[PDB]
Amino acid sequence: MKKYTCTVCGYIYNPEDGDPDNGVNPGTDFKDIPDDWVCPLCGGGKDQFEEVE
Ligand SMILES: [Fe+3]
């Protein structure tokens, strides 16, 4: 599992931390995050993210 970054604000989704406050548990691969989840910092959709490396 790769990290993904919001290309609008720069937030980085790290799969080993998840986003637990919004129901995304540690270990969730980015493709498997519910498709209505948005960037915690700018509200951008998953469609604005890209793989970090
Ligand atoms: Fe963002």
Indicate which CATH number applies to the domain containing 14: 2.20.28.10
Domain with 35, as residue range(s), is 1-53
C-alpha–C-alpha distance, residues 16 and 6, integer Å: 17
**3-class SS letters over the chain:** CCCEEECCCCCEECCCCCEHHHCECCCCCHHHCCCCCECCCCCCEHHHEEECC
Give the Å distance between the CA of 4 and the centre of ligand 1: 11
Q: From the annotation, which residues make up the binding site?
A: 6, 9, 39, 42
Give Rg (Cα) of the chain. 10
C-alpha–C-alpha distance, residues 33 and 49, integer Å: 12
Give the Å distance between the CA of 12 and the centre of ligand 1: 8
C-alpha–C-alpha distance, residues 1 and 10, integer Å: 19
In b/e form, how buried is each residue of 15-47, taking b as 16+ CB within 10 angstroms? beebbeeeebeeebebeebeeebebeeeebebe
β-strand partners of 24:
19
Number of domains in the chain: 1
Cα→Cα distances 36→16, 24, 31, 53, Å: 20, 12, 12, 24
Q: From the annotation, which residues make up the binding site for Fe cation?
A: 6, 9, 39, 42
Structure determined via = X-ray
